[PDB]
RNA sequence: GCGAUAACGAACGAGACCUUAACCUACUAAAUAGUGCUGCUAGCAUUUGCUGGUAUAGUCACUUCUUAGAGGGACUAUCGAUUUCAAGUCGAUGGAAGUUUGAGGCAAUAACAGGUCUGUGAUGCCCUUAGACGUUCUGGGCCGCACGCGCGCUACACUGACGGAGCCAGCGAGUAUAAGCCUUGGCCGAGAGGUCUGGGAAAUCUUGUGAAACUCCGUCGUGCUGGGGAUAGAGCAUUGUAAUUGUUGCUCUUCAACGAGGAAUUCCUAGUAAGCGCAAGUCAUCAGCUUGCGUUGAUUACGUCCCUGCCCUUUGUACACACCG
């Protein structure tokens, strides 16, 4: 047994929820007690610049956004099992952090 | 726009 | 205003002409029927066409 | 010497800026002598708006 | 029924604990109370020169009673207000640090507070005792 | 009428409010009646409220204003001239004191005096302008009951504001003097001078 | 446990969570008696849900509310809504529905905001002006 | 520049106050200033004493507005 | 409580060669005295034990002299140095609090003391311009 | 780090490849009309739903001009422009 | 869109679409959220109660509030009026929502001698290229003052100023061997600020950002007054290699016009306008500025083409580089 925390971060929610559900599924069929996933409040990185490269025209502004979504899952399992779960459900978009 | 004139 | 457009009016009349017996005066039954008949990419457009075909069936 | 006249029909917007409305009034007592008159404020049907003077019609405004 | 601080109006509860604490007389008043301003945003010292320190200590005691380990920076923020900057817009400015620290120190050596764990200053076993006492002798009229 | 004993004690007057809903638990709407057939449907006093602060949605549709209480419309119209916008708690406090002063002065129903002053303050014929692009032209037209009521409230609050401007006399008692005088038809009051001058010009324009 | 219903009322941003348990006529605001709700001049807005039906309805229930967010007035409206909704949810769940429909009838006939949270929210600000609709003064 | 309200209370004004304020339907700070020609502060102290002397009954209490009446 | 008096009130006071209206409250009458602001007058009144509930004409001669004594000898009455008008004086380095005629006297001496050394601030004082760096493009129109 | 190189499947459906090819032709001296219609037809031959080519600059004239070479069906507003 | 119809049936744009706000006691979970219970514990009345504190092991429960994903929900739904009985419009009823449900993002066919080569290791050409128009160092200027104009902030008081007390948000940002971030707390200091520790690379700490308007109790009493705080004198700290021609902050003092504003002219339809503050950007320091956010929260239409701007039809043309003809 090992108390293991899994932190999930990505910009797009489709792959984040796919990885989250796949890990929960494997932590379900493996009789490993789990807590999660916990949807942490998403952070909206907003940048409002002026459209005009010069300073002529009507004052019009862009409003760009970058949502960051975070999920944490708590597992009680050996480190070999959790790491091989990470390699089974490794995805380019979603980042994974493992903390003891 | 100006003509640099030297002194030294 | 609440003016229906051509893309919903013509779709609703096509529904009237293609599935008349299966249609009825209930908006929810019409809505479910349109969902299971025609492929609409959004529930908003779906509800709108269902409302117009409901009004047509009323008329 | 004031006469009370219930409105029974809103005819339409008149005046240069459209701020005054032609309306058809009916007197509360002696329910006849229906007149077309102009009113400034917003008006629905069944308004008991009172008239300081009654013996005057209204026509289109320039 | 058991009367508490939450069962009494704040304005006359503070006026009553201030009145009791003044007639009791053990609270130590610093020598600069007739000179200083309460906040840098204020422009004049308090009009109730003799009693403002007592009343402010009563307010601090009641505020700590109703809350948990409030600090002195938070007390300065609480009693600070909008400064009358001349032509620039108003802004929030903190109350005096020395004045607040002396008030809380006076309540700590009179027995109502002590240093609480994980920061702040809790209310004492007898601090609650004497606040509930003032409340009882507050609401009989 | 029975006093209901709770663990959390409830004051006597507010527990007395169970029998009847009264303005500030002091003034009754039962014995108040509008002495004008034409403004009954646009001055709403039939549904009593306890305090003149409801935070309702009366600006959505056209005639929703007729359903807000007339006293709440007065306290809404009081908070004007820039520095007072948004100070509704101050406006309700001033109105509450004004009713108490109107009761203590002349010994009448405060909301009866407000209703009488509103029916008595709205001009019955106004001379609208028909100017052709700049030139001065006036035509006498009738005034709808809704505009008569809300122009009465506009003039009543403007008169109280101007009587209370740069004056030691407080706004609540300037409002009290203007409302009592307009209720009793005195020509000394503002919004009665204005109403008379409006109907005089309308008589001199038709 | 016991007969407990938990509810919430809302105004613009303020939310008051009401817990209604079976007990004595205890009516507290954040652990404080209802006789000292601020502002003083608006105390009758929260007195309306009590005195309209009669305090006898509160013999069997005790109410503890927690109001956070919003502003002073929005919190007053949130508390009075939380009180009204907690009483309604208790009647709907543990007493006959005749009483629940009577309470809902009086409540709706008196004030819509007592049970349904107002959906109006602040419009976002748009560039080119200091407000949602307001624009910078234009000059030629 | 016409106010010239009295700020010092003599005996002639004191008894004029006690002889005139009672014959009023409604007295307040502004009423006292308007008709007795005394200052606002003197009106407030006059009200605070007349209430202790029983001539005046407090109809309503407020900092910004003091509504008072005769006790007879 | 309200008290009455006859013949003791003084409509006009004369302190530091300045006429003071006797029916003004003491804190702001002394604020009428040049060099004495509201903040300073409240403190000289508390050091002179003159309760603020008294009008200027209500005040007696003994208190007025005790006040002018405190104002003329501030350090002698436990008035902090940092509270004073003219502290760390240029010539003698002592803490001062200038009054009605001395304020403009030592202010003048400061203007000439900068202009004699021909500092930039003294020059701008001579020219009548703003000295604290303010822009004069669009507001120096008086 | 490991780099793998993969050929783009639909050169006609890749605007980057078509733009690089057009640049290499204009820099190879091919006429604008022939190159633009060469990409209009390469895109349609590849199966594009629509295609539009705009060439702006100065060409053998002191005054500058722009020419658009559209084809087929094109959408302009909304999300589908971000999708298709 | 209906309809009339030498037109019929279509495409782009509009509309659809996407983001965000408002509903979910209906699912899925949450010690970085909350609650009820339970341990342990305090005060007051002793009624078994009421307020607290504590529990990253009580190795509790739950998701109403908090977070966020899959969905559901509104389509003018039902009923009355008018209408070509059509598109629609106005009222109610139900509803969280019946103004495109509110707000935005994207946005056609062509075009402008509109603005930028002072954003580009984007550029053609011209100029300069060693005493440089390249780059760097020092000091000054961009602030400069008889004046005209534009965007604004404070105000002209009493619906107010001070003095105490009450005491409620949301949007966000935050560091490491650096070159210094957000900083709770303790101890000094009237303040500004100083010193010592700790937390936070963050739903955990700053932070419940206890913000300001707002409410209560007092003094003031229509006075250029305790409104207003320029101008000016002296001093104390912070930032910066350097504050003088003041960075900013704080203390005392100085006590100006302004007593509601001419001709003209701007913005504004609902949580909107107006007040009221807060965060982020520029940033060693400096926000009277923008970009957003929330507190309090209206008056008055819900109409018209009278002014103003734009569009369409007819019409005239000796214009087509198109009236700058």
Swiss-Prot record, chain A:
Entry's localization field: Cytoplasm
Gene encoding the protein: RPS20
Keyword Repressor recorded: no
UniProt organism field: Candida albicans (strain SC5314 / ATCC MYA-2876)
A Gene Ontology term for the protein's cellular component: yeast-form cell wall
Biological process terms in GO annotation: translation
Coiled coil: none
Subunit structure: Component of the small ribosomal subunit. Mature ribosomes consist of a small (40S) and a large (60S) subunit. The 40S subunit contains about 32 different proteins and 1 molecule of RNA (18S). The 60S subunit contains 45 different proteins and 3 molecules of RNA (25S, 5.8S and 5S).
Main location: cytoplasm
An MF annotation (GO) of this entry: RNA binding
The protein's name: Small ribosomal subunit protein uS10
Section covered of the full-length record: 18 to 117 of 119
Function, in words: Component of the ribosome, a large ribonucleoprotein complex responsible for the synthesis of proteins in the cell. The small ribosomal subunit (SSU) binds messenger RNAs (mRNAs) and translates the encoded message by selecting cognate aminoacyl-transfer RNA (tRNA) molecules. The large subunit (LSU) contains the ribosomal catalytic site termed the peptidyl transferase center (PTC), which catalyzes the formation of peptide bonds, thereby polymerizing the amino acids delivered by tRNAs into a polypeptide chain.
Family classification: Belongs to the universal ribosomal protein uS10 family.
Keyword annotations: Cytoplasm, Ribonucleoprotein, Ribosomal protein
From Swiss-Prot, chain B:
Organism superkingdom: Eukaryota
Function according to Swiss-Prot or TrEMBL: Component of the ribosome, a large ribonucleoprotein complex responsible for the synthesis of proteins in the cell. The small ribosomal subunit (SSU) binds messenger RNAs (mRNAs) and translates the encoded message by selecting cognate aminoacyl-transfer RNA (tRNA) molecules. The large subunit (LSU) contains the ribosomal catalytic site termed the peptidyl transferase center (PTC), which catalyzes the formation of peptide bonds, thereby polymerizing the amino acids delivered by tRNAs into a polypeptide chain.
Binding partners and assembly: Component of the small ribosomal subunit. Mature ribosomes consist of a small (40S) and a large (60S) subunit. The 40S subunit contains about 32 different proteins and 1 molecule of RNA (18S). The 60S subunit contains 45 different proteins and 3 molecules of RNA (25S, 5.8S and 5S).
Protein name in the entry: Small ribosomal subunit protein eS31
Gene designation per UniProt: UBI3
Shown residues within the full chain: 80 to 87 of 151
Curated annotation (Swiss-Prot), chain C:
Family: Belongs to the eukaryotic ribosomal protein eS17 family.
Organism whose genome encodes this protein: Candida albicans (strain SC5314 / ATCC MYA-2876) (Yeast)
Whole sequence portion shown: 2 to 60 of 137
Location in the cell: Cytoplasm
Functional summary from the UniProt entry: Component of the ribosome, a large ribonucleoprotein complex responsible for the synthesis of proteins in the cell. The small ribosomal subunit (SSU) binds messenger RNAs (mRNAs) and translates the encoded message by selecting cognate aminoacyl-transfer RNA (tRNA) molecules. The large subunit (LSU) contains the ribosomal catalytic site termed the peptidyl transferase center (PTC), which catalyzes the formation of peptide bonds, thereby polymerizing the amino acids delivered by tRNAs into a polypeptide chain.
Subunit structure: Component of the small ribosomal subunit. Mature ribosomes consist of a small (40S) and a large (60S) subunit. The 40S subunit contains about 32 different proteins and 1 molecule of RNA (18S). The 60S subunit contains 45 different proteins and 3 molecules of RNA (25S, 5.8S and 5S).
Official protein name in the record: Small ribosomal subunit protein eS17
Curated annotation (Swiss-Prot), chain I:
Compartments where found: Cytoplasm
Pfam family for this entry, one: Ribosomal_S13
Gene Ontology MF: a single term: structural constituent of ribosome
Role: Component of the ribosome, a large ribonucleoprotein complex responsible for the synthesis of proteins in the cell. The small ribosomal subunit (SSU) binds messenger RNAs (mRNAs) and translates the encoded message by selecting cognate aminoacyl-transfer RNA (tRNA) molecules. The large subunit (LSU) contains the ribosomal catalytic site termed the peptidyl transferase center (PTC), which catalyzes the formation of peptide bonds, thereby polymerizing the amino acids delivered by tRNAs into a polypeptide chain.
Family from the record: Belongs to the universal ribosomal protein uS13 family.
Subunit structure: Component of the small ribosomal subunit. Mature ribosomes consist of a small (40S) and a large (60S) subunit. The 40S subunit contains about 32 different proteins and 1 molecule of RNA (18S). The 60S subunit contains 45 different proteins and 3 molecules of RNA (25S, 5.8S and 5S).
Protein name per its UniProtKB record: Small ribosomal subunit protein uS13
Record organism: Candida albicans (strain SC5314 / ATCC MYA-2876)
Species classification: Eukaryota, Fungi, Dikarya, Ascomycota, Saccharomycotina
């Amino acid at each position: 047994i090992h108390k293991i925390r899994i932190t999930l971060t990505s910009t797009k929610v489709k792959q984040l929820e796919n990885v989250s559900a796949n890990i929960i599924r494997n932590a379900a069929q493996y009789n490993i007690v789990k807590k999660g996933p916990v949807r942490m409040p998403t952070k909206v990185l907003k940048i409002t610049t002026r459209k005009t490269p010069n300073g002529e025209g009507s004052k019009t502004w862009d409003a760009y956004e970058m949502r960051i979504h975070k999920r944490v899952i708590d597992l009680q399992a050996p480190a070999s099992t959790v790491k091989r779960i990470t390699q089974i459900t490794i995805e380019p978009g979603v980042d994974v952090e493992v903390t003891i | 726009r100006k003509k640099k004139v030297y002194t030294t | 205003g609440r003016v229906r457009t051509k893309t919903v009016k013509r779709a609703s009349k096509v529904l009237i002409e293609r599935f008349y017996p299966k249609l009825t005066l209930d908006f929810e039954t019409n809505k479910r029927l349109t969902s299971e008949i025609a492929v609409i990419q959004s529930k908003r457009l779906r509800n709108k066409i269902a409302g117009y075909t409901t009004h047509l069936m009323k008329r | 010497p004031v006469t009370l006249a219930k409105v029974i029909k809103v005819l339409g917007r008149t005046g240069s800026r459209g701020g005054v409305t032609q309306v058809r009034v009916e007197f509360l007592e002696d329910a006849s002598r229906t007149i077309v008159r102009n009113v400034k404020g917003p008006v629905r049907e069944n308004d008991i708006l009172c008239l300081m003077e009654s013996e005057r019609e209204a026509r289109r405004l320039r | 029924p058991g009367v508490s601080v939450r069962d009494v109006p704040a304005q006359d509860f503070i006026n009553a604990y201030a009145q009791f604490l003044q007639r009791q007389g053990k609270l130590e008043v610093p020598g600069y109370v007739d000179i200083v301003k309460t906040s840098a945003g204020n422009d004049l010292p308090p009009q109730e020169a003799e009693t403002w320190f007592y009343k402010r200590a009563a307010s601090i005691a009641r505020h700590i009673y109703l809350r948990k380990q409030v600090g002195v920076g938070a007390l300065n923020k609480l009693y600070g207000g909008a400064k009358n900057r001349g032509f620039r817009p108003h802004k929030h400015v903190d109350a005096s640090g020395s004045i607040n620290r002396k008030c809380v120190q006076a309540l700590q050596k009179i027995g109502v507070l002590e240093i609480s764990p994980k920061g702040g200053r809790r209310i004492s076993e007898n601090g609650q005792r004497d606040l509930d006492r003032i409340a009882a002798q507050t609401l009989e009229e | 009428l029975q006093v209901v004993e709770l663990a959390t004690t409830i004051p006597l007057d507010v527990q007395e409010a169970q029998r009847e809903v009264k303005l500030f638990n002091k003034w009754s709407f039962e014995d108040v009646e509008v002495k004008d057939v034409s403004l009954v449907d646009y001055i709403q006093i039939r549904n009593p409220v306890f305090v003149s602060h409801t935070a309702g949605k009366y600006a959505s549709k056209r005639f929703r204003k007729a359903q807000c209480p007339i006293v709440e419309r007065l306290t809404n119209s009081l908070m004007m001239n820039g520095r007072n916008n948004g100070k509704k708690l101050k406006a309700v406090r001033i109105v509450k004191h004004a009713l108490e002063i109107i009761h203590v002065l002349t010994e009448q129903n405060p909301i009866q005096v407000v209703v009488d002053a509103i029916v008595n303050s709205g001009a019955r014929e106004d001379s609208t302008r028909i100017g052709s692009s700049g030139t001065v032209r006036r035509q006498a037209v009738d005034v709808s009951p809704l505009r008569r009521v809300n122009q009465a409230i506009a003039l009543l609050t403007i008169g109280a504001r101007e009587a209370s401007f740069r004056n030691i006399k407080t706004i609540a008692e300037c409002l009290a003097e203007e409302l009592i005088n307009a209720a009793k038809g005195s020509s000394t009051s503002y919004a009665i001078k204005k109403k008379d001058e409006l109907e005089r010009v309308a008589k001199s324009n038709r | 446990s016991t007969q407990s219903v938990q509810t919430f009322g809302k105004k613009k941003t303020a939310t008051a969570v009401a817990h209604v348990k079976a007990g004595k006529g205890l009516i507290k605001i954040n652990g404080s008696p209802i006789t000292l709700v601020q502002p003083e001049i608006l105390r009758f807005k929260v007195y309306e849900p009590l005195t309209l039906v009669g305090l006898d309805k509160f013999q069997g229930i005790d109410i503890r509310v927690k109001v956070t967010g919003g502003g002073h007035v929005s919190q007053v409206y949130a508390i009075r809504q939380a009180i009204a909704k907690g009483l309604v949810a208790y009647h709907q769940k543990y007493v006959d529905e005749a009483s629940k429909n009577e309470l809902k009838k009086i409540f709706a006939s008196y004030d819509k905001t007592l049970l349904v949270a107002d959906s109006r929210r602040m419009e976002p600000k748009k560039f080119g002006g200091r407000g949602a609709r307001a624009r910078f003064q234009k000059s030629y | 520049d016409k106010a010239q309200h009295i700020v010092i209370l003599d005996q002639e004004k004191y008894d004029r106050i006690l002889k005139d304020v009672p014959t009023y339907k409604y007295v307040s700070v502004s009423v006292l200033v308007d008709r007795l020609k005394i200052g606002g502060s003197l009106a407030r102290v006059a009200l605070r004493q007349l209430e202790e002397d029983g001539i005046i009954t407090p109809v309503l209490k407020h900092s910004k507005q003091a509504i008072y009446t005769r006790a007879q | 409580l309200v008290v009455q008096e006859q013949g003791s009130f003084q409509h006009i006071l004369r302190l530091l060669n300045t006429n003071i209206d006797g029916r003004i409250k003491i804190m702001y009458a002394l604020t009428k005295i040049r060099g004495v602001g509201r903040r300073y007058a409240n403190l000289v009144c508390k050091k002179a034990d003159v309760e603020l509930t008294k009008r200027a004409g209500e005040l007696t001669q003994e208190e007025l002299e005790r006040i002018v004594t405190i104002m003329q000898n501030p350090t002698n009455y436990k008035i902090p140095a940092w509270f004073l008008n003219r502290q760390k004086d240029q010539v003698d380095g002592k803490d001062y609090h200038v009054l009605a005629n001395n304020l403009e006297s030592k202010l003048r001496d400061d203007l000439e003391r900068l202009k004699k050394i021909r500092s930039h601030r003294g020059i701008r004082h001579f020219w009548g311009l703003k000295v604290r760096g303010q822009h004069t493009k669009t507001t120096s129109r008086g | 780090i490991a780099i793998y190189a993969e050929r783009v499947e639909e050169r006609g459906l890749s605007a980057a490849v078509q733009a690089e090819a057009l640049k290499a032709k204009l820099l190879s001296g091919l006429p604008i009309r022939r190159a633009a219609y060469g990409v209009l037809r390469f895109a349609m031959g590849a199966g594009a739903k629509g295609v539009e080519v705009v060439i702006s600059g100065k060409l053998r004239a002191a005054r500058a001009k722009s020419q658009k070479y559209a084809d087929g069906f094109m959408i302009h507003s909304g999300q589908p422009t971000r999708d298709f």
